[PDB]
């Protein structure tokens, strides 16, 4: 029922890493980390879709602007 935008990520941060960091907040329906077709590597951005809206809200409150590796993560909303 709720989708978030995750950005400003380190190029080596995997989907499995994102799942591990975001999953403790609530049940996740789908995670899609955007990849480069040419020179196969992460684009630094993606979308995490929580089953619950209040669970997605707490994930944003606790992860937005906080450093994962050394790059401060940018967690936001959509549409």
């Amino acid at each position: 029922r709720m989708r978030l935008y995750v950005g400003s990520l380190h190029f080596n941060i995997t989907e499995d890493m994102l799942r591990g960091i975001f999953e403790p907040f609530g049940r996740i329906e789908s995670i899609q980390l955007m990849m480069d077709s040419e020179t196969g590597r992460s684009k630094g951005y993606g979308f995490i879709t929580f089953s619950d809206s209040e669970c997605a809200k707490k994930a944003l409150e606790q992860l937005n602007g906080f450093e994962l590796a050394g790059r401060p993560m940018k967690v936001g909303h959509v549409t």
Binding site: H10, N12, I13, M17, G20, I21, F22, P24, F25, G26, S30, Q32, S37, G40, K58, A59, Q62, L63, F66, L68, A69
Partner: protein
């Protein structure tokens, strides 16, 4: 010999439960019996490591705050390194616990980290690091596990050394989504 380790070995011919089969569906033959000469046989092995035993052993003998400890709740285990040449598994143990504070009483909920090296030849673990007791004030269960895994991620990235082309763990997964299927070493793409 130690109580924290459990080893099981099973042989096959034409603790976790295993439904070892052929490519059709026959469950083969679960045994340990004699089949003289290396005449094609399967060998499954299972070396287990009880986290709850490890946690209790490291709090008891290797934590300075060990006397303050009451009980632990949830625990999250993240692998930090795997050394295949020395057969050693470096695990980090994230922990929610109950303990009394410094003599400055009242019992409180805390969070800590336990690094432990697990030998696969011996089955014996050895503690390599015991974290300081950090208080959990007004932060949720999800908030503490997110911060813990972020710290593991932080550490493994920091110690990440490039591997040779051919010691890589191939990981394949498609959602229903991939645009191309690439064959890296031969510069060939399948466009989906």
């Amino acid at each position: 010999e130690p109580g924290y380790v459990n080893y099981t070995k099973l042989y096959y011919v034409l603790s976790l439960p295993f439904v070892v089969t052929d490519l059709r569906g026959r469950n083969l033959r679960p045994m340990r019996e004699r089949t003289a000469v290396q005449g094609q046989y399967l060998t499954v092995e299972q070396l287990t490591l009880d986290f709850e035993y490890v946690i209790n052993e490291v709090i008891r003998h290797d934590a300075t705050w060990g006397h303050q400890f009451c009980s632990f709740s949830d625990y999250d285990i993240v692998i930090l390194e795997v050394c295949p040449e020395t057969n050693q598994v470096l695990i980090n143990i994230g922990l929610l616990l109950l303990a009394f504070p410094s003599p400055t009483l009242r019992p409180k909920t805390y969070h800590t980290s336990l690094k432990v090296a697990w030998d696969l030849n011996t089955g014996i673990f050895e503690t390599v690091s015991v974290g300081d007791l950090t208080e959990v004030k007004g932060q949720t269960s999800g908030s503490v596990w997110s911060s813990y895994r972020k710290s593991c991620v932080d550490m493994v990235m920091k110690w990440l050394v490039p591997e040779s082309s051919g010691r890589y763990v191939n990981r394949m997964t498609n959602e229903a989504s991939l645009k191309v299927l690439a064959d890296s070493e031969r510069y060939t793409w399948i466009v989906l």
